[PDB]
From Swiss-Prot:
Interacts with MAD2L1, MAPK14 and MUC1. Interacts with iRhom1/RHBDF1 and iRhom2/RHBDF2. Interacts with FRMD8 via its interaction with iRhom1/RHBDF1 and iRhom2/RHBDF2. Interacts with TSPAN8. GO terms for molecular function: cytokine binding; endopeptidase activity; integrin binding; interleukin-6 receptor binding; metal ion binding; metallodipeptidase activity; metalloendopeptidase activity; metalloendopeptidase activity involved in amyloid precursor protein catabolic process. Keywords: Cell membrane, Cleavage on pair of basic residues, Disulfide bond, Glycoprotein, Hydrolase, Membrane, Metal-binding, Metalloprotease, Notch signaling pathway, Phosphoprotein, Protease, SH3-binding, Signal, Transmembrane, Transmembrane helix, Zinc, Zymogen. The keyword Transmembrane applies. The precursor is cleaved by a furin endopeptidase. This is Disintegrin and metalloproteinase domain-containing protein 17. GO terms for cellular component: actin cytoskeleton; apical plasma membrane; cell surface; cytoplasm; cytosol; endoplasmic reticulum lumen; Golgi membrane; membrane.
Length: 251
C-alpha cells in the first residue's frame, strides 16, 4: 500500500432538499452531519483488509462540500439535479433514481473530472424503498468519461447518491451510514452479495448479511456494517488498479 496514494477524496454535494430537511436551513448543521457520516464510513473502509493481510488503510476524505441552499432555477423544458420539481413525474416526491444519478453526473461533470468521487446527498422518497444508487460494480472511483449522445458532452461515472428520506421519514443515522457505505462500495467495484455464496450472505445466527447485500441492511446485526469476502475480492482488484490513478495522501 502506497501511503501517498491511499485516500479517495470526495466532492460532497448537499442539494436544497437535504439543506432544508436535514440541515434545518443551516450550513453548520448540514456540513456537521456530512462530515461525521463520511468519517464513520471512512472507519469501515480504512479498517478493511482487502487481501485479509496488510492491504488496509484505504479510505475516503471530503475535499469539498457544495451546499445548495435553494432550488436551481430552470428555463421551461430544461432540467437540473437541484431543480425544485421531481423528474419525470413532477407530482411525485422524488425523481426516478437512475435519471437523477445521470442528471447529477451531467451537471457536476467539470468538478467530477478533478476528484476521485462525487457524491450527492438528497432528501427525497424514491419509489419502492430505494435509498441510493452509484456507478461501478462501468464507472466508480477515478473519473471515467462517458459521451452522452443526449447531453452532447462527456460526463464522468465517478458518482453516486444517498437519500436520507425513506417511506415518509428521516432514516436513522445508523441506516444512512449503511446506504453511503453500500453506494461507495459499488464505486470501489463491489457487486451485490449473492444468496448462493453462504460465506457472503450469512444467516442471522452467523452475524447476518454484509453491507453489499441487495436488501437494505438495518445495522442491528454484526456483519451489516462490514464488507463480505466477495466485496473484498472485487474491491482489492479495483484498488490495485485505481489508487495510483487518482488516490491521494490522507490529510
Ligand atoms: C445499505 O443501503 C442499501 C443497501 C441495498 C440497497 N439496494 N438499494 C436499491 C439499489 C438500486 C439498484 C438499481 C435500481 C434502483 C435501486 N441501489 C443500490 O445501490 N443497490 C440496489 O439494489 C438501495 O437503495 C440500497 C441501499
Ligand atoms: Zn446496490
Amino acid at each position: 500500500p502506497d501511503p501517498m496514494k491511499n485516500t479517495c477524496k470526495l466532492l460532497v454535494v448537499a442539494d436544497h432538499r437535504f439543506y432544508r430537511y436535514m440541515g434545518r436551513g443551516e450550513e453548520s448543521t448540514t456540513t456537521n452531519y456530512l462530515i461525521e457520516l463520511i468519517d464513520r464510513v471512512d472507519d469501515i473502509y480504512r479498517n478493511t483488509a482487502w487481501d485479509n493481510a496488510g492491504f488496509k488503510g484505504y479510505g475516503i476524505q471530503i475535499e469539498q462540500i457544495r451546499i445548495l441552499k435553494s432550488p436551481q432555477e430552470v428555463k421551461p423544458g430544461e432540467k437540473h439535479y437541484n431543480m425544485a420539481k421531481s423528474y419525470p413525474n413532477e407530482e411525485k416526491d422524488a425523481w426516478d433514481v437512475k435519471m437523477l444519478l445521470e442528471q447529477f453526473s451531467f451537471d457536476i461533470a467539470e468538478e467530477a473530472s478533478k476528484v476521485c468521487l462525487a457524491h450527492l446527498f438528497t432528501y427525497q422518497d424514491f419509489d419502492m424503498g430505494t435509498l441510493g444508487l452509484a456507478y461501478g460494480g462501468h464507472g466508480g472511483v477515478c473519473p471515467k468519461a462517458y459521451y452522452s449522445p443526449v447531453g452532447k458532452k462527456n460526463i464522468y461515472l465517478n458518482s453516486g447518491l444517498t437519500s436520507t428520506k425513506n417511506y415518509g421519514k428521516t432514516i436513522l443515522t445508523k441506516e444512512a451510514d449503511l446506504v453511503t457505505t453500500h453506494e461507495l462500495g459499488h464505486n470501489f467495484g463491489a457487486e451485490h452479495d449473492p444468496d448462493g455464496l453462504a460465506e457472503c450472505a450469512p444467516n442471522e445466527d452467523q452475524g447476518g448479511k454484509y453491507v453489499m447485500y441487495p436488501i437494505a441492511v438495518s445495522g442491528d446485526h454484526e456483519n451489516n456494517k462490514m464488507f463480505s469476502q466477495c466485496s473484498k475480492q472485487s474491491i482489492y482488484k479495483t484498488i490495485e488498479s485505481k489508487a495510483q490513478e487518482c488516490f491521494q495522501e490522507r490529510s
